[PDB]
């Protein structure tokens, strides 16, 4: 293995609905990260709100926490920070998916104002609770790695500007799929996979695995679609984001037939990623390339594993 020994492997085969070819693990610092997440949940969502109730269900963990599983490759000190930072983004998602698109985009621009290299969390005392919590965690994530902080801030601003900026329905997979990689947060998550390992890829290194990265991004968000369809199908939204409804429209099929199609699409993207990795590895590969491969496979395989059994996608209104 090319990444530090910070995780224990999970036996996915013991879970009947876990279908991924990729491995799953769980961080050795799981308890400590769960504590940080429950604390930030208290502060970044208000009592009595829907987003507070969803945050609690999201960290009801019969098989493990989503972050300690999916980001198990991260150094423990970094894992607590990136988990709480993405957790604030996930609370924001639950808040803004329920808003009309225009109001939602204002809220994204509001939260984006926290994204400063010189962020002072006190200057957001009269803001909403997500601004307050994000500024505090972001402050720490800058201070832990100031060399990477500009890139992280650029990544976070690009996310809030683009992940939810299209309002329509989609009618073809070939247009939905590129957008859903952004919408599902993969460019943020995969950034933090590298950041949590205190490593980067060069421009040339990234370009050499970019098609692989896109296939994995496809697997990650479409697998969430597959598992979150039941809870999403009756959600009241002006912009459903789920491959099942896209395929229903593109091919004029029932929900059930479209969900079978989606699962096949996912499995073929897992195979495409595996082919693309095989081709890359016919040329010499740096240690950094090898550890991105290993960690992103644990991210995608762990995500499948956690989604398979997460109360979030089964316990709803």
Ligand X SMILES: CC[N+](CC)(CC)Cc1ccccc1
User: Which spans of this chain sit near ligand X (rule: CB under 6 A)?
Assistant: 86, 89-90, 93, 184-185, 188-189, 220-221, 224, 303
Q: Which residue has the tokens 């962020």?
A: 119
Partner whose binding site includes residue 248, from a copy of itself, ligand X, Mg ion, none (CB under 5 to 8 Å by kind):
none
Asked whether position 228 contacts Mg ion by CB under 5 A, the answer is yes
> Shortest distance, CB of residue 307 to Mg ion, whole angstroms?
9
Judge contact between 73 and 28, C-beta under 8 A. Answer: no
* Phi–psi pair at 126, nearest 5 degrees: -100, 20
Which of residues 55, 95, 160, 265 is near a copy of itself by CB under 8 A? 265
Partner whose binding site includes residue 301, from a copy of itself, ligand X, Mg ion, none (CB under 5 to 8 Å by kind):
none
Partner whose binding site includes residue 185, from Mg ion, ligand X, a copy of itself, none (CB under 5 to 8 Å by kind):
ligand X
How many helices (H) and strands (E) would you count in the chain? 14, 2
Dist. CA 25–CA 11, nearest whole Å: 8
What is the contact mask toward a copy of itself in residues 193 to 232, using x (rule: CB under 8 A)?
Answer: ----------------------------------------
Q: What's CA 199's distance to the chain center, in Å?
A: 19
Residues of 161-183 as b/e, b for ≥16 C-beta within 10 angstroms? eebbeeeeebeebeebbebbbbb
CA dihedral 29→77→311→262, nearest 10 degrees, is -110
Asked whether position 275 contacts a copy of itself by CB under 8 A, the answer is yes
Which pair of structure tokens corresponds to residue 153?
Answer: 């801030």
Which pair of structure tokens corresponds to residue 232?
Answer: 């999403």
What is the contact mask toward Mg ion in residues 75 to 94, using x (rule: CB under 5 A)?
Answer: ------------------x-
Asked whether position 13 contacts a copy of itself by CB under 8 A, the answer is yes
> Shortest distance, CB of residue 221 to a copy of itself, whole angstroms?
17
Q: What's CA 132's distance to the chain center, in Å?
A: 21
> Shortest distance, CB of residue 237 to a copy of itself, whole angstroms?
25
Q: What single-letter DSSP state applies at residue 71?
A: T
Partner whose binding site includes residue 63, from Mg ion, a copy of itself, ligand X, none (CB under 5 to 8 Å by kind):
none
Q: Between 70 and 173, whose beta carbon lies closer to a copy of itself?
A: 173
Dist. CA 209–CA 232, nearest whole Å: 32
> Shortest distance, CB of residue 122 to ligand X, whole angstroms?
25
Q: Which residues pair with 7 in a beta bridge?
A: 27
Judge contact between 73 and 298, C-beta under 8 A. Answer: yes
Q: Beta-carbon neighbour count of residue 43 at 10 Å?
A: 15
Judge contact between 26 and 10, C-beta under 8 A. Answer: yes
Asked whether position 271 contacts a copy of itself by CB under 8 A, the answer is yes
Q: Between 7 and 163, whose beta carbon lies closer to ligand X?
A: 163
Q: Between 90 and 305, whose beta carbon lies closer to ligand X?
A: 90
* Residues of this chain, 238-257, that bind a copy of itself according to CB under 8 A: 251-254, 257
Asked whether position 87 contacts a copy of itself by CB under 8 A, the answer is no
Dist. CA 184–CA 94, nearest whole Å: 12
> Shortest distance, CB of residue 15 to a copy of itself, whole angstroms?
8
Q: Which residues here bind a copy of itself, judged by CB under 8 A?
A: 13, 16-17, 19, 21, 251-254, 257, 259-265, 267-268, 270-272, 274-275, 278
Q: Which positions touch Mg ion (CB under 5 A)?
A: 93, 97, 224, 228
């Amino acid at each position: 293995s090319a990444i530090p020994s910070v995780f224990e492997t999970l036996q996915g085969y013991k879970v009947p609905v876990f279908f991924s070819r990729y491995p799953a693990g769980i961080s050795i610092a799981a308890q400590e990260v769960e504590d940080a997440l429950r604390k930030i949940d208290e502060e970044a969502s208000e009592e009595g709100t829907r987003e507070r109730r969803r945050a609690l269900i999201r960290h009801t963990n019969p098989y493990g926490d989503p972050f300690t599983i999916c980001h198990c490759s991260a150094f423990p000190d970094r894992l607590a920070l990136l988990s709480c930072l993405v957790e604030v983004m996930w609370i924001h998602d639950d808040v803004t998916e329920e808003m009309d698109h225009i109001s939602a985009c204002r809220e994204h621009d509001e939260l984006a104002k926290v994204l400063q290299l010189d962020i002072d969390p006190s200057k957001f005392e009269s803001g909403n609770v997500r601004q307050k919590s994000l500024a505090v965690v972001l402050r720490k994530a800058i201070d832990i790695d100031p060399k990477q902080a500009p890139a992280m801030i650029e990544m976070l601003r690009h996310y809030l500007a683009t992940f939810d900026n299209i309002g329509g329905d989609f009618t073809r997979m070939e247009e939905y799929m590129p957008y859903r990689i952004a919408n599902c947060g993969y460019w943020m998550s995969s950034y933090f996979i590298r950041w949590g390992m205190d490593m980067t890829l060069s421009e040339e290194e990234y370009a050499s695995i970019e098609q692989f990265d896109i296939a994995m991004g496809n697997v990650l968000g479409l697998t969430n679609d597959y598992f979150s369809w039941n809870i999403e199908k009756d959600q009241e939204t002006d912009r459903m984001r789920n491959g099942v409804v896209v395929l229903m429209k593109e091919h004029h099929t029932t929900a059930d037939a479209a969900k079978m199609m989606l699962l096949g699409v996912i499995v073929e993207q897992e195979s495409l990623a595996a082919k693309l990795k095989e081709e890359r590895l016919k040329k010499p590969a740096s240690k950094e390339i090898l550890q991105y491969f290993e960690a992103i496979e644990l991210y995608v395989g762990g995500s499948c594993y956690w989604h398979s059994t997460a109360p979030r996608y089964q316990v709803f209104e």
